[PDB]
Symmetry: D3
Subunit: 288 residues, 6 copies
C-alpha cells in the first residue's frame, strides 16, 4: 500500500536509524508511544520493533525494508536454515553505524594458542549459530552453552571453558576475569529488502531513498582536502589519497574530496614526502 | 560448594531481589561489573544473570536457587515440555513482588464477546506457550504470531487480529488502538529450588533464609491494629480481621497483628459497625 | 454522569494530588499523555488541567471537584468579582499540602517601617488582587505593576519600589537585592465543590471520599504517644497534648493519639515536668 | 542609561536567545539566580523575564529591546487593542528560531470540511485573540472557551467542539482524540524595539548588534556549494540556486554561497540536469 | 555573638548533617550559593566549608561547633602535633553516620601474613598520619608514598608495594588488582566543640542541641518490641535485649524499647528459646 | 618501559584530556574503574590520578608526561621550592583548554584602590604560594589564611579581609558579598615532561604525539577565510589577518588559513575597509 520500513524501537541502533531517515528528509515523529508511524510527506510507514524481530519481519514479507545489525540478521538466518527453511532477503547495503564485534574470550590466567585449543571445550554464548558457523569452518568442535545475557559469568561460574560475546571497550571481560582472544565476526547495521516482486512505485521510492543514504554516508565519511602542490613529487601524493572524483591542481595547490579519512599516518606520509599546509574541511551534504 | 542463588542482573526484579536478600541480612555488593558475587558473611554466591536464563539455570542444576517471575518460569517450562524434556524444580514460595498480568487485548473499535470469538484468528505474543495453554484449556484454537517486543504493533500493522501481552498501567495499549479484554495469567516473582539431593549444610541454609523471607514479607504485609472494643458487638469485629495470632482485649480496647491490609471497605465496615479510633501502625521486622 | 475532579496536570500540587487520591484508594493511571482520566473502580474522572484553570472550572460547573491552592483560587474569585460576576463554590476542606506565602519584599539597603510606608509607591506582583485586598483593608493605596513571573526584577530594574511574591526558602529575593518584610497571605491546597444541586449518588461519593481524605491527613499529622505516668503531676501532662480521643492510663504509663506534632518545645516541657521514656510512633492509616 | 534587552528567563526561547547574543559577542553570565544581568564589555542589560511579559515590557518602554515569539507578541497586542489602547513597537526583524504553529484541531472520529463548519461552535484555546482574528477574517463566528493549558481536554471533556492550540510533533492531539486540521498562525521569535525617540548612542548599538544578528543567522542558513560546471547547460543551474553573491566559474567547476538550504529535491534537479560531485560545506561565521 | 557550626558544604557528610540539624528543629535554607547561613529561629550560623577545613576551623576557635569525620579530624590533629603544635578540642559525641574504614590493601596475587610483613615496604596513602600512627604502634616501619586520590594506582604503577585507603563496597580495589587485608581505622562523623571558655548563653544552646541530637539518634537506632511472655523461661529473654528502660509485662506479653537493633541472630535466639509473634515497630521521635 | 602519561581521573580537565589524546589517535578505554590504562595501538600508559598529584608525579619521575593546569603545577613547584627542594620539569607546551583565573576579591560595599591597600590585611586562599609570589613582587605584605574550598566564606565570616580565588562566571562571589578586583594569575592546562635523560624510542614518541597536539589545536583555532579582493586597498587586509601560510589571490577573491579567530571587531574593520562576502569555514584536521 505504502512503504514499510522496520526499525529498532529502542536501543543501540534506534538513534542512528532515526537520524539516517531524518537526514534523508523523512519527516516522522518517533517521540510517541505509537509503534507504527505514518510519514508526513513520503508514502512511508515506520514500524518500531524489537531488533530481534526485524530479520524475520523481512524474511517473512510482513514489511518491505529493515535496518538491522548483521549479526542479529545472520544469526536468525542461520537459525531458520537450521530448522530447514530457506528464508530469503536482499541486502541493499551495509550502513555506516552499529559497529560491533563478536569475540572468543577465555580466562585471563590461561595462555591462548589458537581456536584449535577449544576443540571439545564448552563455549557459552548468545550467538550459538554465528559461533557454530565459525568453529565449523575451522574444523573445531565444541559444546554450546547458551545464555541470553551476562554471558561473562559462564567461566567463573563453572558453566563454560570460554565465552563468545559482543565486545567494545573490553570493560566487562576484565571485570569478569576474561580477555578477548579472537574476533570471530564484525558487524554493522545494514539495510535489507524483502523478497519477491516489488511494485514499480515503491521500488522507485526504495531507489530514491537508497541514493539519499549513499549521499548521507558519503558526506560524513568523505572530506575536502587542501594541500600544497610540491610540483616535482606530485604523483606520490594522489596515491595515499584515493580520490575517485579526481584532484584539482592550481597555480599560486590541491583541492579534492577524499572518501576515506585522513588518518594521522596518511598525513605524516604526505608530510615527510614534502606537502604543506594540509587542510581537511567537513562536508555537510553531497550528491556526486 | 557454597549456595548459588541466581537473580536478574538488571530490570523489573533486580532491585526487589537485591532488597529481599539485604533484608535477610545478606551482605554482598552488587554495584560492580562482576556477575558472580561472593557473600561477605554467609557461604553464598549470587549469579547476576538474564531473567530469561534463570528457569533453565535452575532446571539444569547449574545453580541452587532462583528468584524469577512465574510467567518467564512457566513459559520456559512449557517450552521444554514441548521439546519433550521433563525439567524439574521445587517452588519454595511465591514472593511479594514483580506482579504483572498477561492479557488478551484487541482493537478498540471492536466489541468483544469472549475468548471463543478468537477461534481461528491470529494472535501476536511473546508468550506463545502461556497463551497456548490458556486457549487450549478453553478449547479455542488460533494461529500464533510471535514477537519479542513491541507486540502492540501487530494489529494496526496487519500482523494479527489480537495480541496477548504484559500490561500494567494500560498506557501502550491505548496509544496503540488496543484495550485489555481478558487477563489470562497473573504472575509474581517466586523463589525456586533446584531438583535432586540437596546437601544437609546448604539445605539448612536454604531453610534459614526461607524463614527470614517469610518474616520480611510478613512484616511488610502484616500490620498492628488498635481499635475500641464496642463491647456488645465484639464478634462481628474479629471476622473482617483475619488475625492468626489472636486479638488482645483490654479494659479502659483492641490490639492485634493483621496479615492482610486494612482496605478502606474493611475500615468502613468496622465504622458503621460501631468501632472507633481505629489505628494501623507499621511493623518494621517480625518473627512469629 | 460520573464524578469530575479537576487537578493540576503538572507542578507544585500534582504529585500531592495524585497521592491524596491514591491514598483514598482511587486507582487511576496518570502516566499518560491523556488529560481526562477514567477511574478503574470508582465512577470518577480526573481532568488534568492548569492550576490557573481550576477555580473557573469549578466556578463554572464544568467539573464537580477541584484541588487548587487558596491563593490561585481566591485571586480568580476576586478577579471575577472585580469584573462584576458573583462566582460561587463550596470549600469542602483545606488540605495538608501546597503550603506557601505571598509576601511584601523591598530592597535590602532600605529600612522598613510598616505597610503604611508603601502608600503611593509602585508594587510589582502576579497577585494584584490578593495584594489589593490586603492594602485596601490596611487603608494603604499604591500603584500596581503586574508581571507573571520574575517578579523580583522589578525594583532593581526601575519598574517598582517593592514586590509582592511567593516565597519559601527566600533564595531568589536575596539573589535579587530583596528581603521579605511582611507575609500578606498564607495558602494551602484545598478541595472545593461546584455550586448548585448535587445529585444524591455523586454526593454520596463526594461524602465517602471526603471521609477518606480526613483519614489520610489525620494519620500523617496525628501520632501515637507513649510516656511514663509520673503519677502525682498527671494533669499538667494531658494539657500540652490535645488528645481528642482521651489518654489511656496503665499500671506497671500512657498511650494516646495526638493530632498535632510533638514539637521539641512540647517534649522539653514534659521533660522538665517529670515525664520519661517519651515515644512517638508513626500511624500509617486511621479511621476514628 | 545603557541598553535594556528583555528575554525569556527560562523555556522554549531562552537557550536560543542566550546563544544569539553569545554569537554576537555579548559576554554575560546567565547562570545566576539574578534576573537583570549587566554585560561585561558592551553597555547592555539583560532582563530575564516571563515570555508573557515581554510584549508589554516593550510596548510600555520599560525596556528597549525584546526577543519574544510572534504569537505571544501579537496576542497581547490584539488584547490591548481590544481594551482600547494603541500599543506601539518596531519589529526589527524576524529571528531564525522558536518556530511553532497554532492550529485548529477537532475530534478524530469527525470529518472536516473547512472552517466554515465551525460557525457557532465552541472553541477552547489559550490564544483567543489570534483565533478570533482568524475566524473574523473568515467571516465565521464561534463561542470562545479559554484555558491556559491542557487545552486538549476540552472536546473529550464536553467543554468545546474543537480546540486551537500550539502544535509540533502532533503527539498530544492524538493522545487526546484530536487531529490537526488547519494551521491558523505560524510564529518565530523576533526582535522588537521600543517606541519613541531612541538616543544616538544606543541606537548605534542597536544597529551594530542587528548587523551581527543578520550575520549569525546568514551563516547558519547559508552554505558553500561546490559543483561541476556541465558547461553547455549552465544557466539552468544558477536558477535553482538563489545566489545573491554571484557564482564563481572555474576551468579544470563552481563555487558560491547559497542563502537557502540544498533540499534533496533541489539536489536531484541538478543531478538529472547533469551536475556532479555536488558538495555543501558549513559556514561558521560570515560578514557579507 | 551567636553559635557558629561548621559543616561540609557538599559531599559524603553534608546531607546527613543538613538532616541532623533539621531533625533538631533548626530551620535554615542550604539551597543557596551562600556559604554562611543565618538560622531563622535559633541564634545560629552554619558555615558551609570543606571537610578538610573543619578540624582546623575548630582547633583554631574560628567556629564553635563542627560536624566532621573522625579520620579527617584525627589526621589533621596528628599533622599539627607533628609540626609541634598542641591543637585542642572537645569531642561532644560520636554521630550515627559517615561510617567508613581505612584499610591496608595489597596485590591480589600475593598471600598476606600480617602487618609485620610490610616492614620496610612502600605504602601509598592519603592518610599518612593515621597509617603512621598504626604501624608505629605495631613496631613496623615503612616508606610513605602520598597521593590525594586514586591511591589504588600505586602498586600496579610501580609506586608502592601496598596502599592504605578508604574502603566500603570493595569495588575499586578489585578493579585495581587489590584486596582489603586489614582494617586499620574505622570512623564516623562526630560533633566537636571549640576549646576555651564558652559563654553561658551559647553553652546552654550547645547543651540543648546536644539533647536533641541524642534523641534523634536514639529514635532511629532504638525500637519498640512486642513479644509473647513464655512465662517460665522469662529471664533468658531480657538478656539478649539490652533494655535500659525496663520491660513491661502483661497478662493476656512484652513491650519495651530496645536501643540496639534486632539482628536476625538475636531474633532466632528468642525463637528457639520459645518466644512468639515477635514484633518490632519504628520509633519516629523520642525523649527519654 | 613504555610511555607514561598522567592525567586527571575526573574533573575540570579529564574530558579535555581524554579528547586531546583521542584526537591524536590514541585508542584507550577510560570508562573503567581501572586507573592505569594500557593503550591498544601505541606503547602508552595513562595513569588516571588526582590533578593535585600530577606536578609531583612528574617532578619525581614516577611518570613521563603530565597534562595539568598551570596554577596547580606552579603552586606545587613554589611549595617544594619553599621546603628547599629544586624540583625540575620541561614544559612541552601550553594547551588550548582548562582556562581559569585566580583573583583578588574583596567585600562589595568597599571601594578598591589597588593591591597596596591590602598591606597587612588577612587574605584567605587555596593558593597561598601563587598569592604570596604575587604580593611579594608587588612589595605588599599580608597575613595568609588558608582554606581548601569555600574560600568565599572568609570575609563575611570574620576570617579574612579579602580572598584570592578561582573565578569564571563570577556567580559565587556575588552570592557571597564579593566582587573580583584584580586577576593575579591566568592559567591553562599544559603538557609537561619529566626531567632526566629520555630514551631515544619514547622520545621519538613524545615528539610524534606533540606534533599531533599542535595539529589538533591549530585546526580548532585556525580557520579558512574567503573574501573579496577589493583590489586597490589590498595590503590593509592581510594586516588584520595574521596569515602565517600566505594569502591566495584569485581573479573572478581571497583564500587563507587564519590562526586566530575572526573576532567581530576584525570583521567590521574589513567591512568599513571595503571587503565583502566574508566567509569563515571550519577546519576539522590540519597538518601544515
Ligand atoms: N558490547 C555490546 C555491544 N556492542 C554493540 N552492540 C550491539 O547489539 C547488537 C548485536 O546484538 P543484537 O543486536 O543481536 O542484540 P539482541 O539479541 O537484539 O538484544 P536485545 O536488543 O534484543 O537485548 C548490535 O548490532 C549492536 O549495536 C552490543 N550489544 C551488547 N554488548 C554487550 O555489552 C557488553 C560488554 O561491553 P564492554 O564491556 O564495554 O566491552 C556485553 O556484555 C555485551 O553483551
Ligand atoms: N508492562 C510490562 C511489565 N509489567 C511487569 N513486567 C515484568 O517483566 C516480567 C514478565 O516478563 P519476563 O520477565 O518474561 O520478560 P523477559 O522475556 O525476560 O524480557 P527481558 O527482561 O529479557 O527483556 C516480569 O516478571 C515483570 O516484572 C513487565 N514487562 C514488560 N511490560 C511491558 O510494558 C508494556 C506496557 O506497559 P503499560 O503501557 O504501562 O501497561 C508492554 O508493552 C510490555 O511489554
Ligand atoms: N516560591 C514559589 C512557590 N511556593 C509555592 N508555590 C506555589 O505555586 C502556588 C501559588 O501560585 P499559583 O498556584 O497561583 O501559580 P500559577 O499562576 O498557576 O503559575 P503556573 O503554575 O500556572 O506557572 C501554589 O499554590 C504553590 O504550591 C510557589 N510558586 C512559585 N514560587 C516562586 O519561586 C520563587 C522563589 O522561591 P525561593 O527563592 O525559594 O523562596 C519565586 O520567585 C516564585 O515565584
Ligand atoms: N507544542 C507547543 C509549542 N511549540 C512551540 N512552543 C512555543 O511556546 C511559544 C508560543 O506560546 P507562548 O510563548 O505564548 O507561551 P506562554 O503563554 O508564554 O506560556 P508560558 O511560557 O508563559 O507557560 C513559543 O513562541 C514557542 O516556542 C510551544 N508551546 C507549547 N506547546 C505545547 O506542547 C503541546 C503539544 O506538543 P506536541 O504534542 O508535541 O505537538 C501542547 O499542548 C502545547 O501547548
Ligand atoms: N570509599 C570511600 C569513602 N567511604 C566514606 N568516605 C568518606 O570520606 C571521609 C573520610 O575521608 P575525608 O572525609 O578525610 O576526605 P577529604 O580529604 O576531605 O576529601 P575531599 O572531601 O576533601 O575530597 C569520610 O569521613 C567519609 O564519609 C569515603 N571517601 C572516599 N572513598 C573512596 O571511594 C573509593 C572506593 O570505594 P569502593 O570501591 O566502593 O570500596 C576510594 O577509592 C576512596 O577513596
Ligand atoms: N571557578 C572555578 C574554576 N575554574 C576553573 N577551575 C579549575 O580547577 C583548576 C585550578 O585549580 P586546581 O586544578 O589546582 O584544583 P585542585 O586543588 O586540584 O582541586 P581538586 O580537583 O583536587 O578538588 C583548573 O586548572 C581548572 O580547570 C576551577 N576550579 C574551581 N573553581 C571554583 O568555582 C568557584 C566559583 O565559580 P563562579 O562562581 O562560577 O565564578 C569557586 O569557588 C571556585 O573555587
Amino acid at each position: 500500500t505504502r512503504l514499510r520500513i522496520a526499525m529498532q524501537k529502542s536501543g543501540r541502533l534506534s538513534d542512528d536509524s532515526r537520524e539516517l531517515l531524518a537526514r534523508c528528509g523523512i519527516k516522522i515523529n518517533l517521540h510517541t508511544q505509537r509503534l507504527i508511524a505514518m510519514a508526513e510527506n513520503m508514502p512511508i510507514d515506520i514500524l518500531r520493533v524489537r531488533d530481534d524481530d526485524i530479520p524475520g519481519l523481512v524474511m517473512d514479507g510482513v514489511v518491505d525494508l529493515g535496518i538491522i545489525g548483521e549479526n542479529v540478521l545472520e544469526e536468525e538466518l542461520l537459525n531458520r536454515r537450521a530448522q530447514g527453511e530457506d528464508p530469503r532477503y536482499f541486502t541493499l547495503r551495509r550502513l555506516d553505524f552499529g559497529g560491533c564485534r563478536l569475540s572468543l574470550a577465555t580466562p585471563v590466567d590461561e595462555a591462548w594458542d589458537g581456536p584449535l585449543s577449544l576443540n571439545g571445550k564448552r563455549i557459552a554464548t548468545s550467538y550459538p549459530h554465528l559461533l557454530k558457523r565459525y568453529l565449523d569452518q575451522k574444523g573445531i568442535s565444541f559444546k554450546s552453552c547458551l545464555l541470553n545475557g551476562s554471558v561473562e559469568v559462564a567461566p567463573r561460574a563453572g558453566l563454560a571453558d570460554a565465552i563468545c560475546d559482543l565486545v567494545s571497550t573490553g570493560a566487562t571481560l576484565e571485570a569478569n576475569g576474561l580477555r578477548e582472544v579472537e574476533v570471530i565476526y564484525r558487524s554493522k547495521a545494514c539495510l535489507i529488502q524483502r523478497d519477491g516482486e516489488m511494485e514499480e512505485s515503491k521500488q522507485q521510492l526504495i531507489d530514491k531513498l537508497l541514493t539519499r543514504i549513499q549521499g548521507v554516508i558519503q558526506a560524513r565519511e568523505s572530506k575536502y582536502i587542501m594541500m600544497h602542490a610540491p610540483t616535482e613529487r606530485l604523483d606520490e601524493v594522489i596515491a595515499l589519497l584515493p580520490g575517485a572524483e579526481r584532484p584539482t591542481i592550481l597555480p599560486l595547490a590541491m583541492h579534492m574530496v577524499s572518501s576515506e579519512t585522513l588518518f594521522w599516518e596518511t598525513m605524516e606520509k604526505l608530510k615527510a614526502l614534502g606537502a604543506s599546509s594540509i587542510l581537511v574541511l567537513p562536508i555537510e551534504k553531497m550528491m556526486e
